[PDB]
Amino acid sequence: IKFTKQSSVASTRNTLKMAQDAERGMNTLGMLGHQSEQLNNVEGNLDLMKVQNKVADEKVAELKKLEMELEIDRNLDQIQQVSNRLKKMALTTGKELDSQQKRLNNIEESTDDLDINLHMNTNRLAGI
Amino acid sequence: LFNDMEELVIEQQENVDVIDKNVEDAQLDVEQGVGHTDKAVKSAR
Amino acid sequence: SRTAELQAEIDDTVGIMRDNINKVAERGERLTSIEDKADNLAVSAQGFKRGANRVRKAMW
Amino acid sequence: MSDPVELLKRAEKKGYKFEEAADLCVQAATIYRLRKELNLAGDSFLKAADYQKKAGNEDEAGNTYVEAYKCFKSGGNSVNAVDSLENAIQIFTHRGRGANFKFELGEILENDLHDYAKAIDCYELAGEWYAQDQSVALSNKCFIKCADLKALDGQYIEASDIYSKLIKSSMGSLKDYFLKKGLCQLAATDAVAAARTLQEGQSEDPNFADSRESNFLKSLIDAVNEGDSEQLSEHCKEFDNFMRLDKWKITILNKIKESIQQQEDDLL
Amino acid sequence: MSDPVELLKRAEKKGYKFEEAADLCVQAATIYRLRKELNLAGDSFLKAADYQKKAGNEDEAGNTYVEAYKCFKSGGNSVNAVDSLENAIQIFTHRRGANFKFELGEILENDLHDYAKAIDCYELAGEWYAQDQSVALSNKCFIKCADLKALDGQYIEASDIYSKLIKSSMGNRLSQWSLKDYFLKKGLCQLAATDAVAAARTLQEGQSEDPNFADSRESNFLKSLIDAVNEGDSEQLSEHCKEFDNFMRLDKWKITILNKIKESIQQQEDDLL
Amino acid sequence: MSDPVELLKRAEKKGYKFEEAADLCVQAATIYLKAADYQKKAGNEDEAGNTYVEAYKCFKSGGNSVNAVDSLENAIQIFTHRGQFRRGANFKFELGEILENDLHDYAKAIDCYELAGEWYAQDQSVALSNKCFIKCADLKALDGQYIEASDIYSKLIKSSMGNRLSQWSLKDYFLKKGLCQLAATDAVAAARTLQEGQSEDPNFADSRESNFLKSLIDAVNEGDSEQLSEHCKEFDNFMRLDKWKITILNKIKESIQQQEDDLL
């Protein structure tokens, strides 16, 4: 009985250690926030390039025209606290990935369109 | 599961860095190009 | 009952994370494609700048 | 603002001449877009794209076709959007994107026009080209869509083959893949193949071995082996209670239960 | 392949002329990079960047300076990398500066151990990031700046930066833990400055403003440290530190802060005589 | 659509002329390497490299691994010659993957991974170089080069030290390194690695990997192969072993058997 309780204590200790390790997910959220700020910048630069390509279109067109029991309990307490916070983190991370996935899809499409507009105007300029 | 996710986002940080740099450079080159087409139109008129 | 609830929550969090891991794969892939296309965009922007400059010199 | 109708008339009269007509059509069409007359703007992009094709500027034509697809889709004209995507896809494929717009075309076919066979073809082709780009996941997404539609369309064997391809590409989603594959093999009355798939998944992927999906697939295989349709229903309810089922699984298991009923008809 | 030395000589002879010299230098330098002679390649990018500056192409000069920084850092020449980053930063600011200033501060802190310049770089990078509304990058820069400042004897300024971090991160669900630590760190700095009352004020503010921090182990640890300093029981502070370490490992920053605090208790014991 | 065969014939006849032949070849191929060769003859090396990448892309898709490898080699050479070592490293990693999985040419895969990691290090991309070095060390240890694999693991440890992000990697790194040192019969080096990991990384000190490595070191010291097997089963019960570890420990057990043969 004593041996089994000792094994249970050791098990809950390792589970707590791993749960704390898992929590240190937050580094992932921090990085996702940083990458989100960068993608916000990419989006702004792409919007500006869309406007500048409109101007380029019109200019190019005109150019062309021109004790053991208690510890088990306390460790379980701590594991429950961390597990709760881990669940919240997993949900938030999923939501953030969803939002960024749609943002990335739009970034990809806009980048392709801009690249093309630039190739178009470059070919037109070549002939002037 | 939290360990793997972290490693994977770190790898993707590189992609985000390169994308940010390239898009910034492209915007500045496009702005210069528009300036050139403006001066070209000014002369052609 | 408390330990069973904790186990259920951990299994659910594993589930949320199992979803999250699939999403981040789709995300790494999107970022690799966007990096290539952003490289394309940078090259095209430089080419456009140079072509416009050459036309500027021509009209002058 | 210039009258878009007059611009289109001038473009037709001029239709370098093709380039000028395309520019006039683009101007009229942007005016239409500014007026929220999305279908007319799409038609005018289409005319501009045709003129650009006549001018030899294939890339410009494809871009204009993409704009036509965009505005037709926003305007609710699915057929013209499909056509524009097709011309854009042909231009792009002929120029060295085809997969992106083919996936979009398959989405349009599946949701707006309900042309499931063409959607399956589009998804398969997009997945093949994405595989050709080593974008393992985009090909995997396209193959997921293709397998889902194929299984819903009565092609269980082909759907299972695509699921095997997905499993092989993703080795090293899988948990579901195995399950789905087995389900398809069970929709084809090939219980032995479903058991083989379950064993392969258990032995190759430790995560799938202890997964609820593996137990559910084993339970379904046992139920089909004993021909106990009620036991299969009980297992389905048990599986739903912890992990909600989706309409795809509903259809597969409904056809399986109707196959048990057909076997009961053969019992007489 | 062309001899990089001959290309550099031709560039010097030609040094439109500046553009041609810069192109020749870039060619010689790419050849050097191909030979893994990173320092010579960096010097050649630097010459090309100088010629580009003389030509009026400031953006190309900045890009070439960035390449100089890259290859000098890869080559182990930290000083030339610092110089290259400085010219690139100046070019960019006159027209990126924050990103390269953060990299420069990292280089100063790790490679050259010039902690004051690293603090200045981090502060400036955070300020510019704030001017761009990039809350997270400014927050990272301010974390680095506050950490170095507290390690450098500037406890009050580090606590002020921690207050700024707290204010910027309040209300954001992503940065909760950061706040939980922020409060603690701030209090620790205020306790390194012998300002126990301010540490108590910070603890009360954190408890009342952030419910997560109120029940956090960090809040209890900070309260225990405040009580220990109030009673002047250095051994009790050590016991609390060991208890805190047993559940949440301490880092070298906290080690230094609490060591100076304990030495301050010893200094108070010297004043007791 | 134009006949691709006729287009290829016209390209061959024309083969500015090289550019036109390359365009014709690209058209015929799109309908379906020669275009890249013509572009090289035309002096457009970058276009040749892009076309080689396209050749590699479709060869890999057609199951023709050899032509895919060749196309990657020409593209890598072109990119490296133009100072684009980033592209060269990416495609060298892809080439190493192709060699390891499709052609089973493990030595060339090791060379490709080592080179890709070195160039990535030259670009300060720590994580990609770390991935390439993981692959290189894994293959080298599986290939009988335990000392070199341990050295690469030491490099990985040094590069990942101080990063909160690569902790787990480190935890494994130390273990793997020790395992390699134990495959080389150098138990003292394995003990030194364990001590260094315990003293340098607090996470590794209390990690199950550290206990397993210590148990393996003790088992090799006492020459108790059965004890090593028991420790391996215990380690598997909580953390599943991978084929790399299986091979390393199998060679270690066979080395104990060789020592037993040497015992007589």
Burial E227-259 (b: 16+ CB within 10 A, else e): ebbeeeebeebeebbeebeeeeeeeebbeebbe
Residue recorded with tokens 């050479």: F77
Question: For the purposes of burial, counting CB atoms within 10 Å of the CB of D107, is it exposed (0-12), middle (13-18) or buried (19 or more)?
Answer: middle
**DSSP letter (8 states) at residue D36:** T
Distances (CA, A) of E166 to D140, E89, E156, E209, F11: 44, 29, 15, 11, 68
- Compute the Cα dihedral for E58, E64, E70, E75 and give only its sign: negative
List of chain F residues whose C-beta atoms are within 8 Å of the C-beta of residue A17: 206
> Quick check: C47 and B32 in contact, CB under 8 A?
no
Q: How far apart are CA E72 and CA E68, in angstroms?
A: 6
Are B7 and F169 in contact (CB < 8 Å)?
yes
> Quick check: D167 and D178 in contact, CB under 8 A?
yes
- If we measure between CA atoms, which residue out of D232, D222, D223, D226 comes closest to residue D253? D232
- For the record, the structure tokens of C47 come out as 């080419």
- Which amino acid belongs to residue F263? L
Q: How far apart are CA E255 and CA B6, in angstroms?
A: 27
Beta-carbon count within 10 A of F92 CB:
28
Are A34 and E174 in contact (CB < 8 Å)?
no
Residues 6 or more apart in contact with residue E45 via CB below 8 angstroms: E25, E26, E29, E64, E65, E67, E68, E71, E84
Are A27 and F206 in contact (CB < 8 Å)?
no
**DSSP letter (8 states) at residue F68:** H
Q: How far apart are CA C23 and CA A102, in angstroms?
A: 11
Helix (H) or strand (E) run with residue E201 in it: helix E196-209
Are B29 and C46 in contact (CB < 8 Å)?
yes
State which residue of chain C sits closest to A124, comparing Cα positions. C51
List of chain D residues whose C-beta atoms are within 8 Å of the C-beta of residue A120: 57, 59-60, 63
Q: How far apart are CA D171 and CA D168, in angstroms?
A: 5
Chain A residues whose C-beta is within 8 A of a chain F C-beta are 14, 17, 21, 24, 27
- Which amino acid belongs to residue F197? G
Q: How far apart are CA D77 and CA D178, in angstroms?
A: 39
Q: Residue A29: what are its φ and ψ, rounded to 5°?
A: -65, -40
According to the entry, how was the structure determined? cryo-EM
Q: How far apart are CA F116 and CA F121, in angstroms?
A: 9
Long-range own/partner contacts, residues D13-19 (CB < 8 A, 24 or more apart): D15/D51, D15/D54, D16/D55, D18/D51, D18/D52, D18/D54, D18/D55, D19/A64, D19/D51, D19/D52, D19/D55, D19/D57
List of chain C residues whose C-beta atoms are within 8 Å of the C-beta of residue B10: none
- If we measure between CA atoms, which residue out of F187, F247, F242 comes closest to residue F214? F187
Q: How far apart are CA D82 and CA D71, in angstroms?
A: 12
> Quick check: D109 and D82 in contact, CB under 8 A?
yes
List of chain A residues whose C-beta atoms are within 8 Å of the C-beta of residue B12: 35
Residue recorded with tokens 């530190």: E241
Alpha helices in B1-45 (DSSP H): 2-44
Chain A nearest CA to E142, separation (Å): 15
- If we measure between CA atoms, which residue out of D244, D253, D121 comes closest to residue D180? D253
- Compute the Cα dihedral for D184, D187, D190, D195 and give only its sign: positive
CA dihedral D186, D188, D190, D195 (to 10 degrees): -30
> Quick check: D97 and D116 in contact, CB under 8 A?
no
> Quick check: D15 and D55 in contact, CB under 8 A?
no
- If we measure between CA atoms, which residue out of D148, D61, D50, D140 comes closest to residue D99? D140
List of chain B residues whose C-beta atoms are within 8 Å of the C-beta of residue C48: 29-30, 33
> Quick check: F148 and F170 in contact, CB under 8 A?
no
**DSSP letter (8 states) at residue F101:** I
Q: How far apart are CA D234 and CA F71, in angstroms?
A: 56
> Quick check: E98 and E88 in contact, CB under 8 A?
no
Nearest to A61 among D23, D59, D66 (CB): D23
